[PDB]
């Protein structure tokens, strides 16, 4: 089940970094408004990627989570003192 | 900068017949 | 009353953004052709009854 | 007696892992035990027609007598001063009350889930007289000593009469003791049933054990020819 | 303990993610400063982005190594009573008979 | 608080639906000029009876786009909108930095609180973390253990004595009562343990009924003797020294728990 964390986590890292570079290369170049919302959606996707990393590390943490003489004498004095014979 | 023992049938056959 | 799952919401939002970008791309690709023609209704048009609609 | 068993085999390295696994599953520590089994085969010097008085064919079968013996006769000099637990296996006038048993060939049926076997058993309490030895008794019945094997291992007590025997088996001879399970431990999972509903329920217990242990140790069904003690 | 120290290391990785967020607000904010028409905030920009990808790379090495520890801990130190009550009653009884 | 936000959703998405529908109708009606009726299929029943096929104007005018592209009046707007994009991105990223910072703080405190509840001596089980005492409670967040706050069911035994009146009895003895995570573990284990022993006593008086040991209250049984009298009660700390039999009651209770351990 760790290979799914390898491929999934690594994919989230590549999408985060590469999508960040695509972001900065799209912030620097109704086309303007479409750039506004494409950049904003890339930013929010980076936020969801960071939150995804936090959830996966949380899943990692959850994976880390998931003699006889003293009795004879003691009971002897206990019974003798109890009954007061 | 960055990169991306034995055989169960033979043992039981010994326990029931004694052949090795 | 209560918002459902977020996967369907974000998916529909991604479809909306895909449609907007898909329309703006072809629109910006054909910006010289649409500016080289005029469109206005023909006599075959019930304008004697409704006039503001044709303006809209 | 109908015994339903499923066998397996492990190595000398995963012994602690299997003991810990079965300890966490059964919730009880293993119990160290041992048993000696002597097999008596028909006397080759004597010849008897394999037929009953009712003109019916008779198949010759071996007779196995098993008993117990304390570990004081098993621990030598280099084994002293050690904890009496499951970690020992990794370092390898009258007569006594014997246990007389005869095992038959398991039932047929392709794609079977369990290994049902019919075994007759009577308890030999004691004896007396001139020839009071168990060997002379078997010679009087018409059987001679063929071979014997001493097995030492651990057993568990779960539910529904299931027994897990993780044991090693040695052959007791005069020239030397050869280890048959050299390299690992023999695993067993049998239930002794004295009805169709109880037999199918026992098969359900064994299938639940194999399903629970699926992935770790595999419990297959042994061959019938490997459990047939008939003389040929 | 083992899971205590490793849990603290995971918390350190989470703080490295927080630092990744600091360097994110720094690359975006100081980047916007670079796009306002200023070039004097360039060295601290490049240093903040280099620290961004460096802290991220350290998070990848320590996190992947941690998952390797998860793979190499299965079976060993990771799972795939009335005695204390009796001794409690014995110590309590001895406390009664001997105040 | 939130219904207003739902109405904001209905308003924004409502306006988006209006502009999208009007845009679709405009595109279809603009299409109807050059149509073979293929684009009239996107119309409404009114637009179909209003517009007609092979209609409107198909005339052509010279190009106006390149003359506007030669001007440099558009780059200004582009730069402005991109700058605003940068600012908004910075703001949202900083807000997310605050939220994730607080979340990491609180959750890290939670982990630092869990470290004292798990190693190999402290036992833990399993979308929350449960724990069995004797039932099974659920552990949540300092930390607290919520069972099924709660009553303190701790039983006690009192020893009575009949004086020269040969009629009733007087109180002569009574057992003393003594009061983070492991503390609640041991306390609740004592609660379930003593309540289980009391359940065994309730299952005991039904067979000791003929020997004088009579059961009266579900949490109070009496024992009749020709000279003395015992009372076993299971109460909390809300109901109810020259006494002498205070030690015999303690020894009697310790013998009760010891006998229960013998049964186990």
């Amino acid at each position: 089940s760790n290979q799914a964390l390898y491929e999934k986590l690594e994919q989230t890292r590549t999408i985060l970094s590469v999508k960040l570079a695509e972001l900065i290369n799209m912030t620097t170049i109704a086309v303007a408004t479409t750039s506004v919302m494409m950049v904003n959606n890339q930013t929010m996707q980076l936020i969801k990627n960071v939150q995804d990393l936090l959830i996966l590390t949380r899943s990692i943490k959850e994976k880390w989570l998931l003699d006889e003489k003293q009795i004879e004498e003691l009971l002897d004095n206990c019974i003798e003192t109890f009954v007061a014979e | 900068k960055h990169d991306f023992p034995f055989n169960v049938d033979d043992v039981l056959k010994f326990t029931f017949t004694g052949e090795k | 009353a209560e918002l459902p799952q977020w996967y369907t919401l974000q998916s529909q939002l991604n479809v909306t953004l895909s449609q907007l970008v898909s329309v703006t791309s072809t629109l910006q690709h054909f910006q010289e052709t649409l500016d080289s023609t005029v469109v206005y209704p023909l006599p075959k048009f019930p304008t004697t009854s409704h006039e503001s609609l044709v303006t809209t | 007696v109908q015994q339903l068993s499923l066998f397996g085999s492990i190595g000398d390295d995963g012994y602690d892992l299997l003991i810990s696994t079965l300890t966490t599953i059964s919730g009880n520590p293993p119990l160290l035990y041992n048993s000696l089994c002597t097999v008596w085969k028909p006397n080759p010097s004597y010849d008897v027609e394999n037929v009953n008085s009712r003109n019916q064919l008779v198949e010759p079968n071996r007779i196995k007598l098993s008993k117990e013996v304390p570990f004081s006769y098993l621990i030598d000099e280099t084994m002293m001063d050690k904890p009496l637990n499951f970690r020992i296996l990794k370092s390898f006038e009258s007569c006594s009350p014997w246990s007389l048993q005869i095992s038959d060939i398991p039932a047929a049926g392709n794609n079977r889930s369990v290994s049902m076997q019919t075994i007759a058993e009577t308890i030999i309490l004691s004896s007396a007289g001139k020839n009071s030895s168990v060997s002379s008794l078997m010679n009087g019945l018409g059987y001679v000593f063929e071979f014997q094997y001493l097995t030492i291992g651990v057993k568990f007590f779960m539910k529904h009469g299931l027994i897990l025997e993780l044991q090693k088996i040695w052959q007791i001879e005069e020239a030397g003791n050869s280890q048959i399970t050299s390299g690992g431990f023999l695993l067993k999972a049998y239930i002794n049933v004295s009805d169709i509903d109880r037999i199918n329920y026992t098969e359900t217990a064994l299938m639940n054990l194999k399903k629970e242990l699926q992935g770790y140790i595999e419990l297959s069904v042994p061959d019938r020819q490997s459990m047939d003690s008939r003389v040929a | 303990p083992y899971i205590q120290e490793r849990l603290k290391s995971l918390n350190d990785i989470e703080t490295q993610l927080c630092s990744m967020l600091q360097e994110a607000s720094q690359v975006t904010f100081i980047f916007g400063e670079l796009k306002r028409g200023n070039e004097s905030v360039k060295p601290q920009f490049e240093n903040h982005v280099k620290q961004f990808y460096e802290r991220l790379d350290k998070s990848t090495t320590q996190l992947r190594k941690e998952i390797q520890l998860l793979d190499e801990n299965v079976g060993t130190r990771l799972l795939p009573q009335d005695t204390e009550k009796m001794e409690e009653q014995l110590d309590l009884l001895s406390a009664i008979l001997d105040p | 608080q939130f219904v207003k936000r739902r109405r904001d959703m209905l308003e924004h998405i409502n306006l988006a639906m209006n502009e999208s529908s009007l845009a679709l109708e405009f595109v279809s009606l603009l299409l109807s000029s050059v149509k073979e009726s293929t684009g009239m299929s996107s119309m409404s029943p009114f637009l179909r009876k209003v517009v007609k096929p092979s209609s409107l104007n198909s005339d052509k005018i010279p190009y106006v786009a390149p003359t506007k592209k030669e001007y440099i009046e558009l780059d200004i707007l582009n730069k402005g909108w991109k700058l605003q994009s940068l600012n908004e991105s910075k703001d949202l990223l900083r807000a997310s930095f605050n939220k994730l910072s607080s979340i990491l703080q609180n959750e890290h405190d939670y982990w630092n609180k869990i470290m004292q509840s798990i190693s190999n001596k402290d036992v833990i089980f399993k979308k929350l973390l449960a724990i069995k005492y004797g039932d099974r409670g659920i552990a949540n967040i300092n930390l607290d253990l919520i069972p099924h706050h709660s009553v303190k069911k701790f039983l006690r035994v009192r020893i009575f004595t009949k004086i020269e009146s040969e009629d009733d009895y007087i109180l002569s003895g009574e057992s003393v009562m003594d009061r983070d995570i492991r503390k609640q573990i041991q306390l609740l284990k004592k609660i379930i343990f003593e309540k289980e022993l009391m359940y065994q006593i309730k299952k005991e008086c039904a067979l000791l009924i003929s020997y004088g040991v009579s059961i009266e209250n579900e949490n109070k049984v009496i024992i009749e003797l020709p000279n003395e009298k015992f009372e076993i009660e299971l109460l909390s700390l809300d109901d109810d020294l020259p006494k002498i039999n205070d030690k015999r009651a303690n020894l009697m209770l310790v013998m009760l728990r010891l006998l229960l351990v013998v049964i186990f």
Side-chain angles (χ1 to χ4, degrees), chain A residues 1-25 30-53 55-85, chain B residues 5-20, chain C residues 1 4 41 43 46, chain D, chain E, chain F residues 16 23 39 45 53 62 65-66 80 95 130 134 137 139 147 149-264:
Chain A
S1 60
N2 59 332
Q3 299 197 356
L5 298 181
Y6 284 156
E7 301 180 357
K8 190 181 185 180
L9 266 70
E10 284 179 350
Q11 277 173 7
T12 56
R13 303 172 198 273
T14 55
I15 291 178
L16 188 144
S17 61
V18 175
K19 185 159 297 181
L20 173 61
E22 293 178 357
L23 176 143
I24 310 180
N25 294 11
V31 184
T33 65
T34 59
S35 73
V36 181
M37 296 327 291
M38 281 301 299
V39 167
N40 202 31
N41 292 311
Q42 290 178 275
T43 297
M44 295 306 304
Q45 282 182 328
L46 298 182
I47 300 175
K48 297 176 188 176
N49 286 319
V50 173
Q51 179 54 241
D52 276 26
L53 263 299
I55 294 175
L56 293 153
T57 53
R58 173 53 62 99
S59 66
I60 296 178
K61 299 183 177 179
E62 296 181 359
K63 285 185 178 186
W64 279 115
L65 295 183
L66 300 185
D67 180 88
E68 297 182 66
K69 300 177 60 180
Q70 289 75 8
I71 303 180
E72 293 180 5
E73 296 177 345
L74 190 65
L75 294 176
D76 184 29
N77 189 24
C78 176
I79 292 179
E80 291 181 8
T81 311
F82 173 77
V83 305
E85 201 179 46
Chain B
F6 50 86
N7 186 273
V8 181
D9 297 332
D10 292 334
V11 172
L12 296 182
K13 190 58 176 299
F14 171 81
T15 65
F16 284 96
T17 57
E19 52 174 295
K20 296 186 296 299
Chain D
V1 180
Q2 305 301 135
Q3 179 181 284
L4 283 71
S5 56
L6 290 179
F7 298 86
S9 62
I10 64 167
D12 298 327
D13 298 329
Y15 178 79
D16 301 331
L17 187 60
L18 183 58
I19 289 301
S20 179
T21 301
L22 299 180
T23 301
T24 52
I25 293 179
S26 62
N28 300 277
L31 301 181
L32 186 63
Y33 79 103
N34 71 90
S35 61
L36 179 59
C37 304
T38 60
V39 176
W40 313 82
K41 68 174 181 179
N43 197 327
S45 299
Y46 297 153
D47 185 37
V48 56
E49 300 178 334
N50 299 21
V51 57
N52 286 327
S53 61
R54 305 168 180 177
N55 191 27
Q56 297 178 175
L57 299 180
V58 184
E59 306 182 48
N61 197 333
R62 299 175 176 89
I63 301 185
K64 181 178 62 62
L65 279 70
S66 178
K67 65 173 185 180
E68 81 294 317
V69 46
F71 294 93
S72 59
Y73 292 80
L74 308 181
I75 274 72
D76 44 31
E77 186 180 34
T78 183
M79 205 63 61
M80 295 297 182
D81 196 271
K82 290 183 179 180
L84 185 61
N85 59 335
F86 60 94
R87 298 182 180 272
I88 309 179
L89 304 179
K90 297 182 300 180
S91 58
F92 291 100
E93 183 178 40
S94 64
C95 64
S96 301
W98 285 93
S99 176
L100 190 145
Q101 294 180 20
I102 291 94
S103 60
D104 298 334
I105 172 178
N110 299 331
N111 299 27
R112 58 182 179 270
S113 61
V114 303
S115 180
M116 183 179 65
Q117 182 181 41
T118 301
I119 298 179
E121 176 184 294
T122 179
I123 300 299
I124 301 177
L125 292 183
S126 61
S127 59
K130 304 195 305 297
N131 303 321
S132 62
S133 61
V134 59
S135 181
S136 301
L137 295 180
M138 298 303 299
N139 294 138
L141 268 61
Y143 290 86
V144 298
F145 177 80
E146 182 178 13
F147 70 99
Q148 65 181 111
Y149 59 95
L150 175 66
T151 169
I152 309 177
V154 296
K155 60 184 301 179
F156 297 90
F157 286 94
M158 285 185 173
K159 299 181 180 180
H160 310 93
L162 177 63
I163 298 181
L164 301 172
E165 294 190 342
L166 195 62
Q167 53 183 310
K168 281 184 172 297
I169 303 163
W170 296 273
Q171 185 174 5
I172 301 300
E173 299 189 50
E174 183 69 20
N177 298 332
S178 58
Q179 182 180 171
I180 302 301
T181 60
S182 181
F185 297 84
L186 180 65
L187 186 56
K188 192 175 185 180
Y190 70 98
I191 303 189
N192 298 130
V193 180
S194 300
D195 190 277
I196 305 300
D197 297 280
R198 185 166 55 183
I199 291 299
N200 296 147
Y201 187 81
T202 301
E203 298 184 24
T204 305
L206 270 63
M207 289 302 296
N208 291 327
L209 178 69
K210 183 183 182 302
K211 182 60 177 60
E212 184 179 13
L213 298 180
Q214 182 178 44
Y216 188 18
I217 176 62
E218 193 276 339
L219 300 179
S220 59
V221 181
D223 199 332
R224 301 194 303 164
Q225 305 299 326
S226 298
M227 300 180 69
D228 185 25
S229 60
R230 290 176 302 182
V231 182
Chain E
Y2 301 93
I3 57 182
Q4 300 179 18
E5 293 179 336
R6 289 181 172 89
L7 181 60
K8 291 180 180 182
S9 68
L10 290 173
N11 294 16
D12 295 330
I13 298 180
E14 295 189 345
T15 60
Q16 291 180 6
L17 301 179
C18 180
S19 67
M20 178 181 62
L21 266 62
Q22 320 301 331
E23 308 301 318
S25 61
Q26 285 171 1
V27 60
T28 53
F29 195 87
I30 301 185
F31 171 75
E33 296 183 7
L34 290 176
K35 257 40 192 285
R36 287 269 183 178
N38 297 17
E39 290 75 24
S40 61
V41 294
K42 182 182 299 181
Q44 64 177 16
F45 174 81
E46 299 182 16
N47 291 18
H48 285 336
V49 192
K50 285 179 180 181
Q51 290 180 21
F52 176 87
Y53 289 102
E54 276 180 13
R55 290 173 186 267
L56 190 147
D57 182 90
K58 296 179 188 301
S59 180
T60 60
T61 57
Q62 296 180 9
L63 214 162
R64 289 173 189 176
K65 182 180 299 180
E66 183 71 18
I67 304 180
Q68 291 177 7
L69 296 179
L70 272 87
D71 204 336
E72 296 181 0
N73 214 333
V74 179
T76 60
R77 297 175 291 99
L78 192 148
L79 300 179
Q81 184 178 8
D82 302 323
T83 303
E84 56 181 352
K85 185 62 179 180
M86 182 187 63
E87 298 290 342
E88 178 183 346
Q89 296 305 307
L90 293 178
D91 297 329
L92 211 163
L93 213 172
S94 63
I96 297 175
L97 295 185
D98 182 30
Chain F
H149 181 59
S150 298
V151 296
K152 300 300 180 300
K153 292 299 182 180
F154 293 94
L155 66 95
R156 51 93 182 270
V157 48
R158 48 178 55 182
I159 299 182
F160 289 175
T161 299
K162 188 168 71 179
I163 58 119
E164 291 83 342
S165 68
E166 307 280 52
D167 201 330
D168 59 338
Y169 304 86
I170 48 93
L171 198 155
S172 59
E174 180 179 343
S175 60
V176 297
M177 306 305 299
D178 184 28
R179 301 181 64 259
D180 181 88
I181 293 91
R182 300 302 300 181
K183 300 179 181 180
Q184 300 180 345
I185 291 293
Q186 297 295 333
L187 261 57
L188 269 65
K189 280 181 179 180
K190 293 177 183 180
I191 295 179
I192 304 181
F193 184 84
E194 293 177 356
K195 286 181 61 180
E196 181 62 39
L197 181 61
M198 182 62 59
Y199 187 71
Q200 298 290 344
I201 297 180
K202 293 187 300 179
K203 296 184 301 180
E204 184 177 16
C205 298
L207 297 183
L208 297 193
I209 180 62
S210 180
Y211 298 155
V213 184
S214 300
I215 169 176
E216 183 179 84
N217 183 269
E218 292 77 13
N219 299 330
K220 173 180 177 180
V221 299
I222 58 180
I223 307 174
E224 299 183 1
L225 284 76
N227 297 331
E228 296 180 347
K229 167 180 181 179
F230 296 98
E231 287 187 355
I232 302 179
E233 303 176 341
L234 177 62
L235 79 169
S236 181
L237 287 314
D238 57 331
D239 294 28
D240 300 33
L241 299 180
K243 286 81 179 180
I244 305 300
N245 299 334
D246 293 334
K247 184 170 177 179
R248 300 175 59 184
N250 296 324
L251 296 179
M252 181 179 178
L253 179 55
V254 178
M255 285 187 298
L256 296 184
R257 299 192 183 96
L258 281 176
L259 280 177
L260 186 55
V261 174
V262 174
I263 295 181
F264 293 155

